[PDB]
Amino acid sequence: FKVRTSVKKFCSDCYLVRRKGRVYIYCKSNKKHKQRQG
Amino acid sequence: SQVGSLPLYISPEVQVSINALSMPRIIRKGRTSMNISQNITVKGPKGELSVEVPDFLHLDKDEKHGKINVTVQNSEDKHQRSMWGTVRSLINNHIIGVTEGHLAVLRFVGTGYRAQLENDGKFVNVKVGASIKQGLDVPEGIVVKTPAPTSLIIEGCNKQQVLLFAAKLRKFHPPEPYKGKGIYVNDETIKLKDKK
Amino acid sequence: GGLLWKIPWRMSTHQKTRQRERLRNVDQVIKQLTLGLHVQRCQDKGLTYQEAMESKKKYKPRSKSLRLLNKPSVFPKENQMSSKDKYWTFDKKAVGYRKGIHKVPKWTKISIRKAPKFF
Amino acid sequence: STRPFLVAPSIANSITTEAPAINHSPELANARKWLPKRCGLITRKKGMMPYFDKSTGERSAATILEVNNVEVIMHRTSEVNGYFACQVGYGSRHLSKVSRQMLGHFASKVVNPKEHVAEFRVKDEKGLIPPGTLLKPSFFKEGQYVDVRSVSKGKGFTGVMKRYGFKGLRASHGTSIMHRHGGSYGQNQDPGRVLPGRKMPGHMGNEHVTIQNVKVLKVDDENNVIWVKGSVAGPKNSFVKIQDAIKKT
Amino acid sequence: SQKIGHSGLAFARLWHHVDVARDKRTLGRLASAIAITLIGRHKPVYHPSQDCGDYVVVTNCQKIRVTGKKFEQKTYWSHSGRPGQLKLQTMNKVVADKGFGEILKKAVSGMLPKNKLRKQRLDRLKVFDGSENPYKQNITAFAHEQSSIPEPLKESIFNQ
RNA sequence: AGGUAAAUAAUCUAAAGGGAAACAGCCCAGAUUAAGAUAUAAAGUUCCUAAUAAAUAAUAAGUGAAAUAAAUAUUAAAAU
RNA sequence: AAUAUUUAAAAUCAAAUAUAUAUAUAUUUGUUAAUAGAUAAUAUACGGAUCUUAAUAAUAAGAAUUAUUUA
RNA sequence: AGAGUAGAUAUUGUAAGCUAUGUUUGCCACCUUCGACUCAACAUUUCCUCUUGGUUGUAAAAGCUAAGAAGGGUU
RNA sequence: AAGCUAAGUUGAUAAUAAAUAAAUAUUGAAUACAUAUUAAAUAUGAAGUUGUUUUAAUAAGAUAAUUAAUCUGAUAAUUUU
Ligand SMILES: [Mg+2]
Ligand SMILES: [Mg+2]
Ligand SMILES: [Mg+2]
Ligand SMILES: [Mg+2]
Ligand SMILES: [Mg+2]
Ligand SMILES: [Mg+2]
Ligand SMILES: [Mg+2]
Ligand SMILES: [Mg+2]
Ligand SMILES: [Mg+2]
Ligand SMILES: [Mg+2]
Ligand SMILES: [Mg+2]
Ligand SMILES: [Mg+2]
Ligand SMILES: [Mg+2]
Ligand SMILES: [Mg+2]
Ligand SMILES: [Mg+2]
Ligand SMILES: [Mg+2]
Ligand SMILES: [Mg+2]
Ligand SMILES: [Mg+2]
Ligand SMILES: [Mg+2]
Ligand SMILES: [Mg+2]
Ligand SMILES: [Mg+2]
Ligand SMILES: [Zn+2]
Structure with a gap:
C-alpha cells in the first residue's frame, strides 16, 4: 500500500473502492498500484 | 434497476412465497x-432458505410461463433501486441452490498440501505447511466431500455461505506467486513470477 | 496574535436580518427626503399638502448628492442589492478579495452598498 | 371493600419490556470472574521449617499452616447475595471475647464461638460444601497448588529507600544531609503540584497479600497441619486463607 | 393579594411519568424538556431562590432516540486529576456499563443550573431502562382518566 | 511579529452600562438621583440563560454549531 | 449514453425597477457540494449540556448546522 | 526532472510549488545558569517487542519501505 | 541468641472470553460489468481496548442481638501480633 493524499489509478486493471471513509485503489494485475487516500 | 427488472423463472417444484415478519426491524x-x-422464502427439492427484505419491495407472481417479477414502490429513490437489484439476484441464487445446488472446488497445490475430513464430515482438517494442526468446522447446510486428498469439494444451498467457507479454507494458505502453491477456490489463477 | 479578538468570520442569521433592516431604513430616509422636497416644491407652485401628495408627476431632487442617492446604480436599495453586497465588503488584502461587513469598524452606522463590478 | 387508588393511563398502558442486562450488574460480574471450583479453609501460620524430599534429597523451606476447628458456618448464593461463597470459621474462642450478637449468630449456625471468620468465593452452586461440616487438612491433596491470602508483617513508617528501592544520594562527594532522601518530587510549575501517587515515605506492611501457585508439600490430619512450600505473608499466629490455585489447575 | 391563600398545593412535588417508547423526541431535546420540569420553571409559583421542581420518572429508556452515529461515536469523558488517567468511553460502552438511563441522566445534569440545588434536582429524576419500576404507584392520576384503562390492569398495577 | 515608523478616523487613556464564554483599545451606548409602564441599540430567543415561530433549498461529514487551514487528490452536481 | 471543457448573469436568457409606454431604452438581480489533505506533549474542550428524527401513535418531537428569506 | 542492469512512483526524488511544528539558530522587546546525582510524569513524529500492505528490485534467511500499535522495555 | 536484613529463599509478568485497529475476505446491487459495504446481509483480524488478576477505599446486601445480675463501645492496667 502507498498511503498518500493523491490517489490516481495507474493502469486499466486498477479499480477505485470507497471503504471505511477512505478511497482505496486496488489493482487486479500489478500489486504495486495499491494506494490509499490518507 | 437493469438487474431487478430481469424476471425470474421458476420450475413447479420450487415455490417463492412472501410474508410479513413476526417482529420487523428498522435500519x-x-x-x-x-x-x-x-420475509421471502425459496423452498425446493434440496432444501429451503429465506431472505429478510424491506417493505417497499414486493413480488409479482404470474401463473403463465413460470415467471415472477420484483418491483419497488419508488425506483427513483436511490436506496430502493440499489436494494431491488440485490434482492432479485439473491432470490435467483437461492432458486439455483434449491434446484441444482452451489459448489466450490478447492484444489491444494504443494508437497504434502492436502485436506482431510476428520470428524466424519463435521471438521475439515487442512494440512498446508504448519507444525500446529489447522482446520475449521463445517457450518449447517454445508456438506463437504473429498474425491482426492489434494482436491476438496464444498457443497450447499446458500451461495453466500459455501463461498465464504471456501474463502476461509483458502485463507490458511492463499496461492504464492513464486511457486503456484496453496489453495485455489474454483477457477482461481495466479501470474507466476520468473524464478531467477 | 496573543490577544484574542474573538470575532467570527461570518454573521449570524439575526445579525443579517438587522443589517437588512438598517439598509431598508436608510432607503426609507432617502425616500422621505425626496418626498418632502417634492411636497415643498408643489406648495411653492401653489398646491395644498394633500394635493401635492396626490400629484401624478413627482419632482426629482435638483441637488447633486440627493440625485445620486436616488440612482440605484450609485446607491442601490436593499431589495435591489445582491445577497453578497449586503453581507460582504470588498477588501483587496483578503483572500477572495472579500470580507464580512461586520468586520468593518462602525458598520452599523457606516453605509457601504456598492462593491466593484467583478470583485 | 377495596381501597381507593387511581392509576395513570401512561403507566397502565405502557407496553411491557424487560430491561437489557448491564455489565455493572452483579450477575454479569459473577460470570466474568475467574474463580475456583471448590471452597477453601482458614489456617494459622504456626511457623516455618525444612522439608526434605526423601527420594531426590532436595531440601525446601516449608511453612506450617495449622488447621483447627475449621468449619463451614454458612454459605451465600447468587439469588440472595449476588455471588456463591462459603463462610468458613476457624478455631475456638471464649464467651468473654465474643460479642452477644456474634454468639447468637454462632448458635443459629450451630457452631462454637469462632476465632476468625472468612468467606471463600466459588464459581458455581456445586462448589458449596454442606454447612456445619468440619474441614480437615486432607481437604487438599499433596502436590496440588493453592493460592494463599494473609496480612503481611507490619514494617511501620518507612522511607522511600525501603518502600520503593530508591537509590538515594551518594555517601561522599559533598552530599549534605539527604543521603536516604527521594530527591526530586515533581516539576517546576507545569504540574505546579505533586501529582497523585508520587512515591513518598509512609507506612508499609500490614496489608493483604495473595501468593499464587504455592505447592502443598505435605498434608497430615494427625498433627492438624498443612505443610506448604515456601513463604507465607504475615507473622507467626497470623490467619492464612488457603484455596485451590485458579492459575495452576 | 394574589399570593395570599393556601400555597401547599402549588409547592407540591408531583411525579411525572415519561414512557420513552411512546415519546418521539431525541435524547437531548427530551433531556432539555426534563430539566425545566426538574427546576420547576413550568409552574408559575417558581422563584430562583426556592427549589420547587417535580419528580420525573423515565421508563422504557432502552428505546431512546439518538440521531446520527452518536451511539458509536459520542465519547463521554472523565478525569481523576492524576495525569494520564483521562477515561474516554463511547456512548454504546457507557450504555453497556450502566444503561440508556445513565446517558439520559448525564444530559439532564448538563441541562440543569450549576449550584447547590443541582444535585437534588438530578436525584429527583428516576430513570429505568425497561418498563418495571417502584414508582409506578405514585405517578399523578385522576378519576376521570380511569375509564380509559381496562379493569384488571389497574388491579395488577396496584398489586405490583 | 502583541514588531517598527509615521498618515486619517474611532475608542481606551480619563468611560461605568449591554454584547463579544472570560476581555483597556472590537460591536452598541456616554452613569445628576430614583422609579420600572412603554419604545428600543448591539447582541440574542432548546436547557444552563432573559426571549421564537415559520418558509424554501443544501449538508450526513457531528461537517458545522462566535477564533473559516493551503496546494493537490477522489467522489458526485449543474451548464456547454 | 460517450468524449472534453467551464463552474460563468461579462455576453446570453429570465425576473424586477425607472423614462416615452401592450413596445423601446437605461439600470438592478439570478450560475455547485462533500470527503481526504488535517498533525505533541497536565485533560474531552462548539463557553458547557447537547443538536441531524421515526410509520404504527400520540390535544405533542422531527437541527439547536449551512444559504436565502418572512413575521 | 533524474538515478534504479530494462521501467519516474520496489527503493530513490535536483532546483522551483503548498503546509504543519514551535524541538534549533535568529528577529521582536509585552515581560528584568550548563552538566552530574535523585525521582521521574507526559507525548508519539515507534528504536525494540505484537498485527499487516508493497518489495521485475519479497525464493529462503537477513533486509528496505509503508499502515495499525504508547501494553511492556529502551546500557 | 532473638530480631532486622540481601549475598539468601519462595512466588508472580494475571488466563479463558468479548468487541475492535491497520489489513484480509463472502454474497451483492446502486452502475447489464465491477465493487469486502463511504449500501442491505455475512466473516477473519494486534504486546493495543474492554475485561481478567492483584491491592486500597467504600459498604448495597446478609446472619445475629435488642435497656442489658456478664448488651455494645470507651476511659484504666499488662502488652505486641
Ligand atoms: Mg547508597
Ligand atoms: Mg554527613
Ligand atoms: Mg506596539
Ligand atoms: Mg496617564
Ligand atoms: Mg468600557
Ligand atoms: Mg471621550
Ligand atoms: Mg452624561
Ligand atoms: Mg465539531
Ligand atoms: Mg471554533
Ligand atoms: Mg447583467
Ligand atoms: Mg485537547
Ligand atoms: Mg456558544
Ligand atoms: Mg530514467
Ligand atoms: Mg527541493
Ligand atoms: Mg517559543
Ligand atoms: Mg502513529
Ligand atoms: Mg523474508
Ligand atoms: Mg491489555
Ligand atoms: Mg455483481
Ligand atoms: Mg465481488
Ligand atoms: Mg489479545
Ligand atoms: Zn494497476
Whole structure:
C-alpha cells in the first residue's frame, strides 16, 4: 500500500473502492498500484 | 434497476412465497431509513432458505410461463433501486441452490498440501505447511466431500455461505506467486513470477 | 496574535436580518427626503399638502448628492442589492478579495452598498 | 371493600419490556470472574521449617499452616447475595471475647464461638460444601497448588529507600544531609503540584497479600497441619486463607 | 393579594411519568424538556431562590432516540486529576456499563443550573431502562382518566 | 511579529452600562438621583440563560454549531 | 449514453425597477457540494449540556448546522 | 526532472510549488545558569517487542519501505 | 541468641472470553460489468481496548442481638501480633 493524499489509478486493471471513509485503489494485475487516500 | 427488472423463472417444484415478519426491524441511516418487514422464502427439492427484505419491495407472481417479477414502490429513490437489484439476484441464487445446488472446488497445490475430513464430515482438517494442526468446522447446510486428498469439494444451498467457507479454507494458505502453491477456490489463477 | 479578538468570520442569521433592516431604513430616509422636497416644491407652485401628495408627476431632487442617492446604480436599495453586497465588503488584502461587513469598524452606522463590478 | 387508588393511563398502558442486562450488574460480574471450583479453609501460620524430599534429597523451606476447628458456618448464593461463597470459621474462642450478637449468630449456625471468620468465593452452586461440616487438612491433596491470602508483617513508617528501592544520594562527594532522601518530587510549575501517587515515605506492611501457585508439600490430619512450600505473608499466629490455585489447575 | 391563600398545593412535588417508547423526541431535546420540569420553571409559583421542581420518572429508556452515529461515536469523558488517567468511553460502552438511563441522566445534569440545588434536582429524576419500576404507584392520576384503562390492569398495577 | 515608523478616523487613556464564554483599545451606548409602564441599540430567543415561530433549498461529514487551514487528490452536481 | 471543457448573469436568457409606454431604452438581480489533505506533549474542550428524527401513535418531537428569506 | 542492469512512483526524488511544528539558530522587546546525582510524569513524529500492505528490485534467511500499535522495555 | 536484613529463599509478568485497529475476505446491487459495504446481509483480524488478576477505599446486601445480675463501645492496667 502507498498511503498518500493523491490517489490516481495507474493502469486499466486498477479499480477505485470507497471503504471505511477512505478511497482505496486496488489493482487486479500489478500489486504495486495499491494506494490509499490518507 | 437493469438487474431487478430481469424476471425470474421458476420450475413447479420450487415455490417463492412472501410474508410479513413476526417482529420487523428498522435500519436507520444518517438521513434515510429502511424498514425490514417482509420475509421471502425459496423452498425446493434440496432444501429451503429465506431472505429478510424491506417493505417497499414486493413480488409479482404470474401463473403463465413460470415467471415472477420484483418491483419497488419508488425506483427513483436511490436506496430502493440499489436494494431491488440485490434482492432479485439473491432470490435467483437461492432458486439455483434449491434446484441444482452451489459448489466450490478447492484444489491444494504443494508437497504434502492436502485436506482431510476428520470428524466424519463435521471438521475439515487442512494440512498446508504448519507444525500446529489447522482446520475449521463445517457450518449447517454445508456438506463437504473429498474425491482426492489434494482436491476438496464444498457443497450447499446458500451461495453466500459455501463461498465464504471456501474463502476461509483458502485463507490458511492463499496461492504464492513464486511457486503456484496453496489453495485455489474454483477457477482461481495466479501470474507466476520468473524464478531467477 | 496573543490577544484574542474573538470575532467570527461570518454573521449570524439575526445579525443579517438587522443589517437588512438598517439598509431598508436608510432607503426609507432617502425616500422621505425626496418626498418632502417634492411636497415643498408643489406648495411653492401653489398646491395644498394633500394635493401635492396626490400629484401624478413627482419632482426629482435638483441637488447633486440627493440625485445620486436616488440612482440605484450609485446607491442601490436593499431589495435591489445582491445577497453578497449586503453581507460582504470588498477588501483587496483578503483572500477572495472579500470580507464580512461586520468586520468593518462602525458598520452599523457606516453605509457601504456598492462593491466593484467583478470583485 | 377495596381501597381507593387511581392509576395513570401512561403507566397502565405502557407496553411491557424487560430491561437489557448491564455489565455493572452483579450477575454479569459473577460470570466474568475467574474463580475456583471448590471452597477453601482458614489456617494459622504456626511457623516455618525444612522439608526434605526423601527420594531426590532436595531440601525446601516449608511453612506450617495449622488447621483447627475449621468449619463451614454458612454459605451465600447468587439469588440472595449476588455471588456463591462459603463462610468458613476457624478455631475456638471464649464467651468473654465474643460479642452477644456474634454468639447468637454462632448458635443459629450451630457452631462454637469462632476465632476468625472468612468467606471463600466459588464459581458455581456445586462448589458449596454442606454447612456445619468440619474441614480437615486432607481437604487438599499433596502436590496440588493453592493460592494463599494473609496480612503481611507490619514494617511501620518507612522511607522511600525501603518502600520503593530508591537509590538515594551518594555517601561522599559533598552530599549534605539527604543521603536516604527521594530527591526530586515533581516539576517546576507545569504540574505546579505533586501529582497523585508520587512515591513518598509512609507506612508499609500490614496489608493483604495473595501468593499464587504455592505447592502443598505435605498434608497430615494427625498433627492438624498443612505443610506448604515456601513463604507465607504475615507473622507467626497470623490467619492464612488457603484455596485451590485458579492459575495452576 | 394574589399570593395570599393556601400555597401547599402549588409547592407540591408531583411525579411525572415519561414512557420513552411512546415519546418521539431525541435524547437531548427530551433531556432539555426534563430539566425545566426538574427546576420547576413550568409552574408559575417558581422563584430562583426556592427549589420547587417535580419528580420525573423515565421508563422504557432502552428505546431512546439518538440521531446520527452518536451511539458509536459520542465519547463521554472523565478525569481523576492524576495525569494520564483521562477515561474516554463511547456512548454504546457507557450504555453497556450502566444503561440508556445513565446517558439520559448525564444530559439532564448538563441541562440543569450549576449550584447547590443541582444535585437534588438530578436525584429527583428516576430513570429505568425497561418498563418495571417502584414508582409506578405514585405517578399523578385522576378519576376521570380511569375509564380509559381496562379493569384488571389497574388491579395488577396496584398489586405490583 | 502583541514588531517598527509615521498618515486619517474611532475608542481606551480619563468611560461605568449591554454584547463579544472570560476581555483597556472590537460591536452598541456616554452613569445628576430614583422609579420600572412603554419604545428600543448591539447582541440574542432548546436547557444552563432573559426571549421564537415559520418558509424554501443544501449538508450526513457531528461537517458545522462566535477564533473559516493551503496546494493537490477522489467522489458526485449543474451548464456547454 | 460517450468524449472534453467551464463552474460563468461579462455576453446570453429570465425576473424586477425607472423614462416615452401592450413596445423601446437605461439600470438592478439570478450560475455547485462533500470527503481526504488535517498533525505533541497536565485533560474531552462548539463557553458547557447537547443538536441531524421515526410509520404504527400520540390535544405533542422531527437541527439547536449551512444559504436565502418572512413575521 | 533524474538515478534504479530494462521501467519516474520496489527503493530513490535536483532546483522551483503548498503546509504543519514551535524541538534549533535568529528577529521582536509585552515581560528584568550548563552538566552530574535523585525521582521521574507526559507525548508519539515507534528504536525494540505484537498485527499487516508493497518489495521485475519479497525464493529462503537477513533486509528496505509503508499502515495499525504508547501494553511492556529502551546500557 | 532473638530480631532486622540481601549475598539468601519462595512466588508472580494475571488466563479463558468479548468487541475492535491497520489489513484480509463472502454474497451483492446502486452502475447489464465491477465493487469486502463511504449500501442491505455475512466473516477473519494486534504486546493495543474492554475485561481478567492483584491491592486500597467504600459498604448495597446478609446472619445475629435488642435497656442489658456478664448488651455494645470507651476511659484504666499488662502488652505486641
Ligand atoms: Mg547508597
Ligand atoms: Mg554527613
Ligand atoms: Mg506596539
Ligand atoms: Mg496617564
Ligand atoms: Mg468600557
Ligand atoms: Mg471621550
Ligand atoms: Mg452624561
Ligand atoms: Mg465539531
Ligand atoms: Mg471554533
Ligand atoms: Mg447583467
Ligand atoms: Mg485537547
Ligand atoms: Mg456558544
Ligand atoms: Mg530514467
Ligand atoms: Mg527541493
Ligand atoms: Mg517559543
Ligand atoms: Mg502513529
Ligand atoms: Mg523474508
Ligand atoms: Mg491489555
Ligand atoms: Mg455483481
Ligand atoms: Mg465481488
Ligand atoms: Mg489479545
Ligand atoms: Zn494497476
